[PDB]
């Protein structure tokens, strides 16, 4: 069975949380997901294999902090440098250098390719859920655990969250009454996350959520506001954001996109991000 | 003051040491308890919030509304998000949802439902007469005092008790109590909040009391969101209920809000208007609240 984390792990502050292994002082990242009084344990134990990939935060264990008056704690490796969303927020002009966006986007795609190959959909790709280590490595938070929880109807799948990263196919309407979706929905999210890095927020961020939900299936694909960006960047965004998912490139195709595939300054970019992380952290 | 955005220092304080989490607080000058919802805000969020305060209407205290005491900013260091405090009268006897959950069988007698529903409509009438829409009527946002008073949640610019599932103004929320007109759908491109949306939610809340859950509780939220504008209005599953109750439900849940009754008309509906056992009901509610604290 799954334990209560007391005396094993404790929450420090939020970043997903900074958590601490109580007995050893080792740090961990803790994804807190409310849950309903078993088979949670089972899925985690199937999926945890997958978290070993370098671009996914490795699973440490899982715990539930009971109870009515429940909460799942997904414990994973600590990424000291915080989320890419915090990075952009703490960056002047709320925008990252294009070649930083190329590096980070590729790392996200490598992590996703790993899940997708094994028929896992992440379902929650956004800047908030992509973390950085001190050495500026890029790791996805979660690896299908929250995806499985969003499946079950019940008292802990009663809310619709933010719509800004949702692909068109995820949003029901009369020609799409069953909100049919697959792994390619994660790639639309990656595109939205790339804009997030470029502009500081996803498109439609200033719109009422309900209205954004209405506009996504009906508006053309979002584009970068500014023309300062390269043709290759615009092209990468276009690929992530193919309106009809049936024609959207897969993860392996996007990994071959010139924006992603050709990064002659990688070593330097990592060095720049590392320094930027230091200068900008709060 | 319900129109300025001050530091809460020396006006309100937390007594009990999460985003949108509600804490027990205290009015500094009078010692009167309060419920304090605390939220991180960026600098930009602070401008948005100032604007929403200008948009707020003026209305008096009301026995069926948990008094909104105002909005405040708790300063954090430069580079760090400040805190928004939304301050409300303290109601210590839980929500109507807690009430249902603590009732054996998770269901309420019909005369309890009439009583509570009436109190809800009275709060709503006060808001509506003042050109205010509540926007979030559900069992969770209707509170009890230790005196068994029924009070609508009012955090001013926010209408919910539980912690916001995401950053303010960025999440869709739970769809179950939403009227059709507030759901953007193929035929409703401009999601209408109208005062009558609260009356639909009121109807849903009465089913919530009668059955323990809102209609469509067996659907994933996104599927429910799709269904609500498309389905005919929901109904009570059981036939055990009085004709009056069925008629009240049907009154609240008129599909087209333009053809749905006003609060004043619903307050005259026999199910609401004729409560021969209300004195007993209140007594019964108070005993229930007493038993529970034990
Ligand atoms: Na890993």
Give the topology, please.
2 copies of one chain form a homodimer.
Chain A: E1 9-14, E2 17-21, E3 27-34, H1 39-47, E4 59-64, E5 71-77, E6 82-83, H2 84-89, H3 98-117, E7 130-132, E8 138-140, H4 145-149, H5 184-199, H6 209-215, H7 231-240, H8 251-255, H9 258-261, H10 266-280
Antiparallel strand pairs in A: 1-2, 2-3, 3-5, 4-5, 6-7, 7-8
Helix pairs in contact in A: 3-5, 5-7
Subunit structure (chain B): Interacts with the SH3 domain of the adapter proteins Nck. Interacts (via its CNH regulatory domain) with ATL1 (via the N-terminal region). Interacts with RAP2A (GTP-bound form preferentially).
Domain Protein kinase (chain B): 12-272
Family (chain B): Belongs to the protein kinase superfamily. STE Ser/Thr protein kinase family. STE20 subfamily.
Describe this structure in words.
The structure is a homodimer. By secondary structure, chain A is of the alpha+beta class. The first copy, chain A, folds into two domains: 78 residues, Phosphorylase Kinase, domain 1 (2-Layer Sandwich), CATH 3.30.200; 204 residues, Transferase(Phosphotransferase), domain 1 (Orthogonal Bundle), CATH 1.10.510.10. Helix content of chain A is 34%, strand content 14%. Chain A contains ten helices and eight strands. In chain A, the strands form two sheets. The first copy, chain A, has a five-stranded antiparallel sheet with strand order 1-2-3-5-4, with no helix packed on it. A three-stranded antiparallel sheet of chain A has the order 6-7-8. In chain A, β1 and β2 form a beta hairpin. In chain A, α3 packs antiparallel against α5 and α5 runs antiparallel to α7. The longest helix of chain A has 20 residues. The radius of gyration of chain A is 19 Å and the shape is globular. The termini of chain A are far apart. At the A-B interface, α6 of A face α5 of B. The site of sodium ion (NA) has 6 residues of chain A, from loops. Chain B: It comes from Homo sapiens. Chain B: It is found in: Cytoplasm.
């Amino acid at each position: 069975s799954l334990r209560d984390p007391a005396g094993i792990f404790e929450l420090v502050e939020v970043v997903v949380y900074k958590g601490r292994h109580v007995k050893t002082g080792q740090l961990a990242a803790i994804k807190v997901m409310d849950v309903t009084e078993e088979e949670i344990k089972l899925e985690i134990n199937m999926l945890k294999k997958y978290s070993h990939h370098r671009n996914i935060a490795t699973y440490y264990g899982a715990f539930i902090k009971k109870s009515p008056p429940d909460q799942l704690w997904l414990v994973m490796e600590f990424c000291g440098a915080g989320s890419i969303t915090d990075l952009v927020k703490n960056t002047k002009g709320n925008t990252l250098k294009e070649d930083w966006i190329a590096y980070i986007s590729r790392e996200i795609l490598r992590g996703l390719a790993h899940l997708h190959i094994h028929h896992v959909i992440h379902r929650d790709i956004k800047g908030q859920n992509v973390l950085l280590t001190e050495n500026a490595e890029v790791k996805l938070v979660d690896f299908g655990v929250s995806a499985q929880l969003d499946r079950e109807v019940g008292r802990r799948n009663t809310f619709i969250g933010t719509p800004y990263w949702m692909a068109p196919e995820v949003i029901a309407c009369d020609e799409n009454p069953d909100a049919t979706y697959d792994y390619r929905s994660d790639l639309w999210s990656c595109g939205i996350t790339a804009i997030e890095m470029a502009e500081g927020a996803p498109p439609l961020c200033d719109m009422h959520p309900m209205r954004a939900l209405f506009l996504i299936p009906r508006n053309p694909p979002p584009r970068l506001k500014s023309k300062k960006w390269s043709k290759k960047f615009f092209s990468f965004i276009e690929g992530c954001l193919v309106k009809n998912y049936m024609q959207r490139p897969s993860t392996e195709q996007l990994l071959k996109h010139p924006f992603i595939r050709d990064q002659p300054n990688e070593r330097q970019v990592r060095i720049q991000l590392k320094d930027h992380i230091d200068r900008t952290r709060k």
